[PDB]
């Protein structure tokens, strides 16, 4: 069930965690879906590096990071715009680095409705 | 030339990943990085002693063959099995001189009249890439097929199908992170399957993506390139950022 409001220029942090997954050894990716559109790739972090990847439209605004202490991946969102309104999803996979080309991943997190006014 | 050894016998996700990483390491020795993606060197002024990489493949039946990969485009140009070497038709006279430096100790050398492009190899195989299964099983059988070609035990269709296998599992996986990930999952779940249209569309677009990336204005394309998602839906790509997770190597354009 989608979890589900932010002021323009506001902040929001999403969390990727699952009790069974040692995320420090997974590739993690974030996607977002507007009501009438497909799921758009936002950002990924690679397992076998610390290497981070961003769509151009979020560069300098969104930051992906791993907290290995709490076995969690975060997407920190700053300078939010109405155009960022969407349901956000994280994905994780040991073998595939999440990207726009596919949605076949071992793990998909629960969605979160983000609404920028 | 640099040699990378890989065996299908007991292959794991890790051992295949180590293999593709070493191939990438050898391919990009002379590469430079444009928009965070290594660009393979072009042939101009590239020394002959640095033109090729060798990939030695073994299987459970203890048969081995050695592929020669071109470092300018990661593609298979030929192979050696025992006392025989077979090369695809070179596209010019300079490349014909180039391949005379491969496998110089074999007694029997043969150049096919045809090239190794997919349209040709599919004509000879009698099947399209869409119906040729990939995986550790198909690769092990491809090795045997290549080995016995000099022996007279492999027919032309089976040989072209084996080339299609090797090129996708090695050359295309070296070029594309996405395709390497797809081969890892086949190994992880011990399964064989033909590539999907999204893999095939991506393979067909490698040259065009390299052009758009290298001619781009700090990431943004002059014009969009259509790609195919794995679920079949088609999407436009307008910026290099979207491709960085997908593509590991580019061919030179400048
Ligand atoms: Cl084997
Ligand atoms: Cl050689
Ligand atoms: Cl011929
Ligand atoms: Cl055909
Ligand atoms: Cl096809």
CATH number at residue A35: 2.60.40.10
Distance B62 CA to ligand 1 centre (A): 8
Are B13 and A95 inside 8 Å of each other by CB?
yes
Which residues fall inside 5 Å of ion ligand 2, going by CB? Answer: B 102-103
A54 touches chain B (CB under 8 A): yes
| CA neighbor of B40 nearest in space, from B204, B207, B198 | B207
Supply the range of the domain harboring residue A39: 12-114
Q: Is A63 within a domain?
A: yes
CB < 8 Å to B178, chain A:
96-97, 99, 101-102
For residue B188, the surrounding DSSP H or E stretch is: helix B177-188
Cα(B96)–Cα(B119) distance, rounded to whole angstroms? Answer: 22
Residues whose CB is less than 8 angstroms from the CB of residue B170 and which lie 6 or more positions away in sequence, other chains included: B20, B23, B55, B67, B69, B76
Q: Is A2 within a domain?
A: no
Are B233 and A103 inside 8 Å of each other by CB?
no
Q: Which of B182, B202, B239 sits opposite A56 (nearest CB)?
A: B239
Q: Is A82 within a domain?
A: yes
Q: Which two tokens stand for residue B130?
A: 């869409």
**What is the separation, in whole angstroms, between the first and last Cα of chain A?**
23
Q: Which of B177, B182, B230 sits opposite A103 (nearest CB)?
A: B230
Task: Report in angstroms the alpha-carbon separations of A106 from A48, A90, B19.
Answer: 17, 11, 23
Residue of A nearest to B16 (CA): A95
Q: Is A3 within a domain?
A: no
Q: Is A7 within a domain?
A: no
Q: Count CB pairs under 8 A between chains A and B.
A: 64
Q: Is A72 within a domain?
A: yes
Active site residue B175: yes
Cα(A35)–Cα(A87) distance, rounded to whole angstroms? Answer: 8
A52 touches chain B (CB under 8 A): no
| CA neighbor of A86 nearest in space, from A28, A53, A41, A46 | A41
Elucidated via? X-ray
Active site residue B118: yes
Number of domains in chain A: 1
Q: Is A97 within a domain?
A: yes
| CA neighbor of A18 nearest in space, from A108, A101, A113, A114 | A108
CB < 8 Å to A55, chain B:
239, 241-242
Residues whose CB is less than 8 angstroms from the CB of residue B19 and which lie 6 or more positions away in sequence, other chains included: B4, B6
The separation between CA B71 and the C-alpha centre of its own chain, rounded to angstroms, equals 11
Q: Is A19 within a domain?
A: yes
């Amino acid at each position: 069930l989608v979890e589900t409001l932010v002021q323009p220029g506001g902040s929001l942090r999403l969390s990727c965690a699952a009790s069974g997954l040692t995320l420090d050894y997974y590739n993690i990716g974030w996607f977002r879906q507007a009501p009438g559109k497909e799921r758009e790739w936002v950002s990924s972090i690679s397992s076998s590096d610390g290497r981070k990847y961003y769509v151009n439209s979020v560069k300098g605004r969104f930051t992906i990071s791993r907290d290995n202490a709490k076995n969690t991946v975060y997407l920190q969102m700053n300078s939010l715009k109405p155009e960022d309104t969407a349901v956000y999803y994280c994905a994780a996979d040991r073998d595939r680095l999440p990207s726009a080309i596919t949605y076949e991943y071992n793990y998909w997190g629960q969605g979160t409705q983000v609404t920028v006014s | 030339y640099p040699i990378i050894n890989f065996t299908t016998a007991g292959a794991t996700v890790q051992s295949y990943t180590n293999f593709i990483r070493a191939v990438r390491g050898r391919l990009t020795t002379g590469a430079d990085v444009r928009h965070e993606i290594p660009v393979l060197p072009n042939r101009v002024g590239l020394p002959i002693n640095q033109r090729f990489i060798l990939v030695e493949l073994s299987n459970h039946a203890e048969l081995s063959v050695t592929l020669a990969l071109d470092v300018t485009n990661a593609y298979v140009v030929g192979y050696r099995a025992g006392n025989s070497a077979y090369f695809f038709h070179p596209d010019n006279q300079e490349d014909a001189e180039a391949i005379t430096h491969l496998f110089t100790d074999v007694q029997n050398r043969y150049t096919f009249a045809f090239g190794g492009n997919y349209d040709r190899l599919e004509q000879l195989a009698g099947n399209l890439r869409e119906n040729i299964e990939l995986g550790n099983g198909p690769l092990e059988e491809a090795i045997s097929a290549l080995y016995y070609y000099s022996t007279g035990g492999t027919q032309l269709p089976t040989l072209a199908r084996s080339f299609i296998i090797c090129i996708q599992m090695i050359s295309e996986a070296a070029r594309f992170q996405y395709i390497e990930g797809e081969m890892r999952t086949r190994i992880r779940y011990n399964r064989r399957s033909a590539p999907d249209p999204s893999v095939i569309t991506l393979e067909n677009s490698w040259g065009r993506l390299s052009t758009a990336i290298q001619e781009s204005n700090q990431g943004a394309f002059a014009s969009p390139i259509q790609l195919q998602r794995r679920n079949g839906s088609k999407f436009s790509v307008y910026d290099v950022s979207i491709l960085i997770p997908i593509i590991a190597l580019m061919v030179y354009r400048c």
